[PDB]
Design a protein around this ligand. Sequence first.
Ligand code: ZN
Ligand code: ZN
Ligand code: ZN
Ligand code: ZN
Lengths: 338, 366, 366, 365, 334
Amino acid sequence: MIRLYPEQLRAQLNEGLRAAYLLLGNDPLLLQESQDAVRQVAAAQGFEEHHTFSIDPNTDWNAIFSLCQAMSLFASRQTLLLLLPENGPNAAINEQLLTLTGLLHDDLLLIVRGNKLSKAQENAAWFTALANRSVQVTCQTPEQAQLPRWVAARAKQLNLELDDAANQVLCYCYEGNLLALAQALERLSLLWPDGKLTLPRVEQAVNDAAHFTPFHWVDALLMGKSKRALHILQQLRLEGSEPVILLRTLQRELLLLVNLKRQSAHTPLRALFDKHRVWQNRRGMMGEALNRLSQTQLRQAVQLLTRTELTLKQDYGQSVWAELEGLSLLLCHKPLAD
Amino acid sequence: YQVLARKWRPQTFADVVGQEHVLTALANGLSLGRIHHAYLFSGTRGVGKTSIARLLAKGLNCETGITATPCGVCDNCREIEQGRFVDLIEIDAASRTKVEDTRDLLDNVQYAPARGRFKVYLIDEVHMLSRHSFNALLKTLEEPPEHVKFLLATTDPQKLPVTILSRCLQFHLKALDVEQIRHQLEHILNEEHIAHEPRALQLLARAAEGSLRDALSLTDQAIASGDGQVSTQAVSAMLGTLDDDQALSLVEAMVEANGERVMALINEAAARGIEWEALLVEMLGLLHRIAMVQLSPAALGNDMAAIELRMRELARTIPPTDIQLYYQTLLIGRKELPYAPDRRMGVEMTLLRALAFHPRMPLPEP
Amino acid sequence: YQVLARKWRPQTFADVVGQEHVLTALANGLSLGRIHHAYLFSGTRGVGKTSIARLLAKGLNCETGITATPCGVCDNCREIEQGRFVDLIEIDAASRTKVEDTRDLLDNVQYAPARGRFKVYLIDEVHMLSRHSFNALLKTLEEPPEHVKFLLATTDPQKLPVTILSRCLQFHLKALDVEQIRHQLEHILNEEHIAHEPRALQLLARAAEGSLRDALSLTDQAIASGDGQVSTQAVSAMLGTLDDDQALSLVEAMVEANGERVMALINEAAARGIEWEALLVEMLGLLHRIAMVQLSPAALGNDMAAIELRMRELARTIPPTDIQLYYQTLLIGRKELPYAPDRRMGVEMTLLRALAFHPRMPLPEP
Amino acid sequence: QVLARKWRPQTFADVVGQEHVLTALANGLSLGRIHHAYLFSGTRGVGKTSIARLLAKGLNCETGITATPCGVCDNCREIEQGRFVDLIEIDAASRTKVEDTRDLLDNVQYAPARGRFKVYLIDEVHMLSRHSFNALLKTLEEPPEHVKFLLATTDPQKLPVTILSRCLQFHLKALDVEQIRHQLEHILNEEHIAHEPRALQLLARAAEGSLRDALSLTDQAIASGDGQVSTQAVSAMLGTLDDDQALSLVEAMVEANGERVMALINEAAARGIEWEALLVEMLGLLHRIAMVQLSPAALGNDMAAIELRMRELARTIPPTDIQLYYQTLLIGRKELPYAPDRRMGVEMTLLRALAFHPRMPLPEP
Amino acid sequence: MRWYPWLRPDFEKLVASYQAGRGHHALLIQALPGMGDDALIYALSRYLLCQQPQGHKSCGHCRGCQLMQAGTHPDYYTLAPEKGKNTLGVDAVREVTEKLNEHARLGGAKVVWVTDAALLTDAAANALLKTLEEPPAETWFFLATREPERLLATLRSRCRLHYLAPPPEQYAVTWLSREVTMSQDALLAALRLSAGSPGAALALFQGDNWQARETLCQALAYSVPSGDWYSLLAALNHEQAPARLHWLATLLMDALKRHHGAAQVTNVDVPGLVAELANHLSPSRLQAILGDVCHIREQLMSVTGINRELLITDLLLRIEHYLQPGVVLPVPHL
Ligand SMILES: [Zn+2]
Ligand SMILES: [Zn+2]
Ligand SMILES: [Zn+2]
Ligand SMILES: [Zn+2]
C-alpha cells in the first residue's frame, strides 16, 4: 500500500492504475481532486460504469449482498466508490467492507473515501486485505505550518510569484478553505496578468473583495471593539447572509464561552480548550474574551439571543437585524439590570 | 417610451457600478484570451449577476473580436443585449414551466455555435437545477468542448457541491453602498432632466437593498406616482421615511418638557402616516443606547454620526435614574398600545404620562 | 330608492378618495400605455382594493380607448360597474364552493377576449388560493399572453411567496384618516340635503376603520334608524356606543368616587343595549381628551362644545397624575374583557377597581 | 307545545335586543320606504332569518304595509308557518335543492300570487354557486317593483362589494346574558312553569347570545328534569358542579389556608370538574362581592343561599385586595391552556393568590 | 381495547337501564386517556347487538355475536374521523343518519359510536343534532370525549353525560403491580402523574420513559443542593423535552404545596427530593421557576422550530439568577 500525498498521485497513476485507492481525510478539495485524478485515468481505460455506495452503521447486510449482486453480474469495466461514515467504520462495518473487498478484480476499481482512519481501524480485515494491492492518498487539510507551503506550491504551478507576506495574508483570510485559496489565486492571476503577486497588490485585492465570514463577526464580537463588528455585521447583509445562520454561529461560540467561564477552578484554561476541540489559534482570543466578560454578562447575552431566536420565529419577519446590532453591543460593554 | 431600469442596462464593463476587481479580472482575461470553461457568479438577488455575465458573453462574442470593450453596435452585441442571440443559450432552473428543460438543451453542448466564436450557456440559480439535469452539467464540465462556455450564477453558493465549485472560477458580487447608489441616481436623473429632492433619492437608495436594478425600478414607479417628479412625498408614499421622524427629537422634546412641541411633533408625524408602534420602538431602542453611553463612551455606532452630538448631549445631561424612568414609561406605553381606543391616542397619552410623571417641571394644579 | 354606498360608488378615478399616489400611478400607465401583466393591490379590507381595480379595467376595455378617464356610458363601462363583464373574471379565493375553482378558470387564460381589449382577472386575496391553482397562476405569470392581465388583491402581502411579489407591480392602499372620512361624510350629507350632528359623523368616521365603502353603508343604516336624520342619538345607538354625555357622566361619577351613581349609569345603560367594549373605549378617549386639554386648553374638538364646560372643568380640577391612573385602569380592563366571566361584568369590575383604587378617596375598611 | 316554537316572535314588538335594526325597519315599513334588498349579518343563532320573516309579514299583510302586521290574516298565518307562495326561501348551505337558486331566480320578474310583494329570503347568501350569483346583479341595479330581497349571512366578507353596496345591510348583535336571562324568566312566568334563579342564569349563559338556543335548552331542561326548570336539571345537562365548591375555595384562599385550598382542588378534581368553569365561578363570586361592598343590595336572586357567607367576605376583606384576587385569577384563566395540565394551571393560580397575600406565606432558609 | 376491572360498576348500571327500558338513546362518556373509555363503549354495544343474550352478556353463537366477533356488522357503525385529517366531516354524519333511517338488517337495535366528539366540524355538530331530535325507534348512540365543555351546549344537552371516574388508588396500584414489577412507591407516582388513569400510568413504564424519568430526578438531586442547575441540560435537552419539562414541573409544584402544608403529593416516588427542594427554595423562588419552566415548555411544543438547546440553556441559567439574593423575580402578564 503505497502511502502518498495528493501531489504524488499523478506520477504514480502514470506507472499503473492499482486495485484500490483509499482517499482518507478531511479536506473537501483534496479528496475531490484525488478522486478526479483516479477516475480521469480510469475512464481513459474503458471504465464506463461508475458507482458510489455509502456505508452507515445503519446499513443492512441485505444492502451489502444486494450490492454484491449488482457488481458481480455486470460484465465490463466498472468503478465503485465506497463513502465511509462520518465517524469512521465501526465493528460491524469492518465486516461489510471485508465482504465487499472480496468482490474485486482487475475490471472492478474500488475507491474508498473518508477521513483519516485510526491506527485501530487500520488493523481491520478489510484494510489489511487491500494492503498489498492498493494505494492510500492522505487528503488532510495542510496544517498551520504547511498551509502557506501548500499555497506556495499551488501558486508556483499556476506560474505565480507569490510573496511571503502576501502568501500569509491569503492564509489568514480563508484559513483552511483550500478551494478558496485556489480560486483566489486564480482570480488574483486575472487581476495582475503580470504574475508578480506582491503584498501591496494582494493586500489591496483581498481587502477590496470584502468577503467576511460570519465568524469574523463573532471573532470580532469576542470582546473585540464593536466598531468593526458592527461594520462586519452591516457588511454581512451585503453578502446575502441570512439572519438565522448568524444566530446559530453566535450561539455555538456563546454557549461555549458559558461552559468555559463556568470552569474556572474546574481545570486551568489550557486543558479545557483541548477538551472542547475548537481551540485552534482561537486561544488567546477565547481567553481574552473569558477574561473581560463577567459570568453575568455572558448570561444576559444568552437571553437576548433567545428573544431574538423567538422573535425571529414567532412573527417570522420582525427585523432581527436590529437585535443582532443590539446583541453585538452587549458583548463589549458592561450591562445593567434593566 | 422608456423606463429607467431598462434604459440604463449596462452596455459595457466600463459602466457597471462598483465591482471593480470582478470587472478587471474579467476584462484582463478577455484581453489575454484567458477564459475558463465556466464561471460562477454569486450574490444576493439584486446585484447584477446575470447582467455582468451578459457583458462577458457580449465580450466573448462581439464581432470586433474577443474584447473587454464590445462595441454596442454589431449584431452580436445588439442581440445579446436584447437577450435573443442564437448562441447565448439562457436557462433559469428557477421555473417549473420551461419548454425543453436543461437536460435537453445541455444535450447538444458539443454542437458548435451557429454564430459567433462561442456557444455560451447562461444558467441562473444553478443550485435549483433538478438532479436529473444537474448531473448532465457535471459531466460536461469534466470534459467541456473548447467552443462552449458556462456562465453560471447563484444566490446560494453554499448549496452547491465541491464537484461544481472546484470546476468554476467563483466571483462574488458585493451589494452596493447606499451612498454609492444615491450618487448614481442623482446622475441618471440629471442626464434625464427629471426633477428631484436630495432626501428623495436617499429614501430610494435605502429602499433598493444594495442594488441598482431595483433602485431604478423603484424610481420608475416613483416617477409615475409623483407624475414627473421624484419628490420626497411621492417617494414617501410607497417607501416609509426617516427625516419626518421625531424619534430622537420627540425624546428630546420629552425630557425637555415642552408638550407644545411634543404634540406638534406627533401631529407632524401623523400627517406622514407612521406605524405608531415602530416609533415607540425607535424611542425605546434609543433610550436604551443612551443608557449605554453613560457606562462606556464606545457606544457610538456605524451611522450614529449625524446624531452623535445630540445623543452625546443626552448621555451627560440626563440622570441614569431618569433615563430608566423614561425607558419604562415608553415600555409600558408600548404594551398598552393595541388596546388603546386608537393607536395614535396611545402614543399621545404615553408621552402625556412621561409628561405627567416627569422629574423636572411636571404638570401644575390649583 | 338609493343607499349612498351605491349612489356614490366611484365611477371615475377622480371620485376615489385620498389615495392620490396610487391613482396618479395608474393614470400615467393608462395614458402612456405602460401596462404590466400583473398588478398587486394590498391593504386592509374596506379600502378600495377591488374598487380601484375596477376603474382600471374600466379604462382598459373601454371603447373610448385605453383611458385614465373612462366614459360612464359605453356598454363596456356600464357592464363593468355592475360586476358583470364577459372578460372581467372576478374570483374570490376565500370561497369554498366555486363552480370551478381557480385552476379551472385559469386553464382558459390562453383564450381570446370576447368583447373587451383585455381579459382582466380580478382576484381577491390570492394568498388563500389552493396550492393547486396557485401554481397555475405561477405558470401563467412567467409567460402571460398579450391579451391577459391580472389584478391581484390581498389583506396580507407577506403570505405571498417572493416568486409572485417580484412578478407584479405592487401598490399599497393605505387606510383613510378619521377626519378624512368625516370630512367626506359631511360633504356627502351636505350634498344630499340631510341633517346631521358633527359628533355623530365622527362616530361614523371612526366606526368604519378607513373603509369608505363601510362608512357609507354605515351612514345608510343611520339614516334608516334616525328617520331622515343622522343624529348622534340614532348613530350612538347602532354602535351601541354612549352619547358623549352618558359617557361623560360615567367619567365624572368615577372621579367623584360615588359608586351607586356609577353602577346606576351602567344599569341604565344596559337597558338601551350597549356594546360593553364600547363603553370602555369612549371613556378612554374622553379621558384622553381631558389629558390633552390640560396641556393645551385649545385641544377640544368642535362638536365637543355640548360637553365643553364639563370636559374643561375636570381638566383643571383633576390632577393629570390621577387622570393617567383612570386611563390605565380602564385600558388594562379592556385587556381583561374577553377573559372576564361576562362582558358586562368585566366592565363593572374594571370600574369598581378604579373606585377601590381612587386617589382622592377610596373604598374603606376595618 | 315546546318553548322554542310557541314563542317565535310574531311582531317586531316581541323581538329581543335588536332595538335599532327594528327602529329602521319599523320606520321603513311605516313611511313606505322599502329598498331593493336587505342584507342581514351576524353569527348563527341570532334572529337573522326570524326578523327576516317579520319583515315580509309586515309587507304582504292584508291590513296594508305596516310595522304592525295582523297576526290572523291569511297571509301572516302562512308566512309564519313557513309555507308562503310569495315568500320563497332558499338555503344556500344545502346540496340537494329542487330547482337551485338559478331556477327560482329565473321566475323573479313574474307577478306575486297572493300579496303586494314576491319576497325572496336567502339564508347564507355568500355560499351561492357563481352562475346564479350574477343573475341577482342583473336584477339588483334594475329590479321590478313587486320584488324584494331579504338576505342573510354568517359572514359578509365573503360577499363581493357588488352586492354589499346595492343593499341596505343590517348587523344583528349578540344579546347580553342578563338580556336572555330576563326573557327566559318572562316566558316561564307567563307560562306557569316552576323555575329557580340560578337555573335561568346557567341557561342564559349556556346559550351564547342566542335566544333561539336559549329556549331549545330550556326545553330540554323541561324534558330531562321534572317539568321544572330547576338548578338540578339545568346543571345536569350542562355540567356545573352544583356545589358550593367555588365559594369555599374563595373562602379558604382568602384566609391563606393552602392545605385546604389544595385539598379542595383535589376533591374537586376527583369529581371531574371543568377547571375553567371553576375559575369563572370564582371570578363571578369575587365580582358580586365587590359590588356588595359598593351597594349592599347587590346580592341577587338564588345567591340568597350564600348571602351570609358572601356578605361576611364583603365586610372582612379589603376591596383593594378583592381586586387583587380577581386580577390574579383572571390572568390565571388566560395562562390556563399554557399550563402543562389544566389542574396544575388552577393550582398555579390559587397558590399564587395565597402567596401574594397580605399577611400570608413567607420565605425561609 | 382491553377490559379493565373498574369499568364494571359503570357497565353494570349501563346495562341495568338497557334491560329495564330506562336506556338513553344518546350517551356521552367523559374520561381521561387510558381509562378504558375504549372498552366500555364496545362492551356495551355487544350486549345490545345480541340475538340471544344470556342475561348480563352475550352467547357468542347468534348472528349478532358472530358477525360481532367478525367485527363487520350491519348495525354497528364506527364514526372515526376522516383518515388523514384531525377532524370529522359533515358528510360521514349525514351518510350514517340516513343509513339508520331504514330498517335494521338483523331486526333489532342499531348502534353508533364516536371516537371523540370534540374533534368534529361545527357544521358536523348541527348535522348530528336533528337526528337525536327525530330518534329512529330503538336505535342507540355513544358519544365519547375527554373534554365535554368544548362541546356544543345544545348538543351535550341531548345526551346523557356519564363520568368514568378513576378507581380508588389502592385498587389501581394493585392492578398495576401485576402489569409491571416496580416499587409501589413508583407505581403510585405514575398513577398520580396520570390524574389517576391506570392506563396512562401503565404506559408511563412501557417505553424506557421511566428510566428517562429516573435520570431527571438524579440530575435534580445534584443541582438542588449544589446550585448548578445548568447540569440538567443533559437530562432535559432531548426531543422529549416537553414531557420532561412537565415532569420537572410536577416536582416544583409539590415543593410549593409542602410550604403550605398540603397533604397530597404527586411525586411520592421521591419525597426526599421534594423536601430538600422546598428547603432550599422559598415559596416565591419556586413560583418563579414553575412559570418559566411552564412558558418555556410551551414554546418548545408550539413554535415550529426554536433551538431546544439555546432556549433551555437560557431557562437553566435564568433559574440560577432567581436563586441569587436580591433578585426581583417575574410576575404574570395581562
Ligand atoms: Zn460588437
Ligand atoms: Zn367607456
Ligand atoms: Zn295579516
Ligand atoms: Zn348473541
